[PDB]
Amino acid sequence: TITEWSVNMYNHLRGTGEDENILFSPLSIALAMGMMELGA
Amino acid sequence: TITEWSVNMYNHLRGTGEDENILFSPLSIALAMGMMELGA
Amino acid sequence: YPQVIVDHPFLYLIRNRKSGIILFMGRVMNPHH
Amino acid sequence: YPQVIVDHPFLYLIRNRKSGIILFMGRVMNPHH
Amino acid sequence: ENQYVMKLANSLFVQNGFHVNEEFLQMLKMYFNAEVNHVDFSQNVAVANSINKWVENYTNSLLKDLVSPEDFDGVTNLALINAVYFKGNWKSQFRPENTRTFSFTKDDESEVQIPMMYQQGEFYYGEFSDGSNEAGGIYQVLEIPYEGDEISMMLALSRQEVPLATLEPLLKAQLIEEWANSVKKQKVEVYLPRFTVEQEIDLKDILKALGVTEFLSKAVHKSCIEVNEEGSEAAAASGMIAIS
Amino acid sequence: ENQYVMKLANSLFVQNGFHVNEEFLQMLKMYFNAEVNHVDFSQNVAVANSINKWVENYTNSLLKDLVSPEDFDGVTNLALINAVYFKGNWKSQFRPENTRTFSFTKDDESEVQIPMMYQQGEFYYGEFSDGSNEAGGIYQVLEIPYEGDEISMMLALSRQEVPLATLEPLLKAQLIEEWANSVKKQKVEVYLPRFTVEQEIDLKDILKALGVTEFLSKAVHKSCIEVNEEGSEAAAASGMIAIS
């Protein structure tokens, strides 16, 4: 779900209303959940 | 099972009988089985 | 000569081609800073 | 002065300390080559 | 791929006396190349500096305040952290001598004076149709690669008379694939601005409001990028603070 | 850790028309930083060169023949491959001028003339008791670190009058931990030999004769190292050839 996944957070960070800049790193979060899903 | 695991292959490659050199890379095999156990 | 003046709001993707994984993503509403 | 002449069969470990993961492992029966 | 800089790295922080599945440490250690460091999560301030000094170390100091003393608490036993750091050079970089102030008009109809980068170069260019095709309902797309032919910056741009929000709902994974299956390399004349922005999301909830239901007592994401004439330097870091 | 060289990398080879779980590609792609390359496994020779040229590329050409046309067949759809490559410098390197022939006596009571490296240096040294404590039943242990204080070479050595096989059965994971919880850094005078050896195991069966029961139509491991005065250059590669 690589890019479709990250195109959802982007689709979240802009539903707040505030027409303000938004910047994230799918690669980094995807890597954190990876470890996170290694045994917890 | 990191090192105890690799200390088993070593314990295998020498049960053959041939008192010959043996060299492997636990890190590499451990990495192959990792992908291998990602969905197969 | 296509002309692309990004003098107004846009979204971006610092991404890798060969693999297709996205590094950084977002939109630029305010270019100031 | 400890003296360690590895003039005969031994096993080895090219390993990382801080982490403890083993890179390469094995024993040297014949040093020839 | 050694023509630019992508340096990546993971780690784990856990209470000193706290023990955890050993068949998970190497697990991390090997797969995620994690750095298992023992700390004392009771010392709120002391552990934040720790972790901060870590991420503030694997991202060239672009992210100085990742986790905070507030993200911790007495039950914090673990804390997963990742730090991504990008640093490359436009394959064809702008000239700091063609950079002239221009007026960026936010969709807000507001105004913002700003340093504008200019250059005539070889870029992956592509125009695509949109909901309304009045004035040729087509928004542009520019893909500028960095030195190592591996990383690129894709722009999804609309017309000034149209918001970026009328183009956001179209966004989909297969819209990004069609991005790089049509962007033909031409001789486009770009006008990008020099800019540096850093956001600070708060995962936990977005993860829940996205799917993951399987528990962390917090989550913290942060990242900044600094576009400009030479190239681009971005970094990120994520913190999964576990309660058990 | 940038004082030496550990460069690591994975990849995947699959039939061109063959499709596979997309939520496994990125999976690999992200976690294992895999390179998903499409080939034609029908072309036995053609695919071997491919893969060989790959591993023979991520291990500096120390492993020229990883997979073979024989490891493939008509049903080969996938083929997982990993290549580890180590390259560092003894923190305290030997002098090629103190290297003199010596006679290595294999446990076989055979003889082998050989280039012997010599130096008086600061090494992690440790002696440990063994089954029989006649002549002080204690075998030595030497840990020589490379430039980056991250990698080391641990030697488990016995007395000439005793085989290395009388010490092998003692080997255990916690015996290696006790290795690095006792090896005190002293001023030992070492005599290691210049040597380069490369083995070629055949996984599949050892995996089965080790546990993994969950199917690959083959498996191939290979690796070589080249100890010497300057430092050490080793590499490996593993090939998991899938039939489905």
Swiss-Prot record, chains A, B:
Q: Where in the cell is it found?
A: Secreted; Cytoplasmic vesicle, Secretory vesicle lumen; Perikaryon
Q: This protein's superkingdom?
A: Eukaryota
> Which tissues does the record link to its expression?
Detected in neurons in embryonic brain cortex (at protein level). During embryonic development mostly expressed in CNS. In adult expressed in brain and much less in spinal cord, heart, kidney and testis.
Q: Describe the family membership recorded for this protein in Swiss-Prot or TrEMBL.
A: Belongs to the serpin family.
User: So what does this one do?
Assistant: Serine protease inhibitor that inhibits plasminogen activators and plasmin but not thrombin. May be involved in the formation or reorganization of synaptic connections as well as for synaptic plasticity in the adult nervous system. May protect neurons from cell damage by tissue-type plasminogen activator.
According to UniProt, the name of this protein is Neuroserpin
Organism (species): Mus musculus
Tell me the part of the parent protein that is shown. 25 to 64 of 410
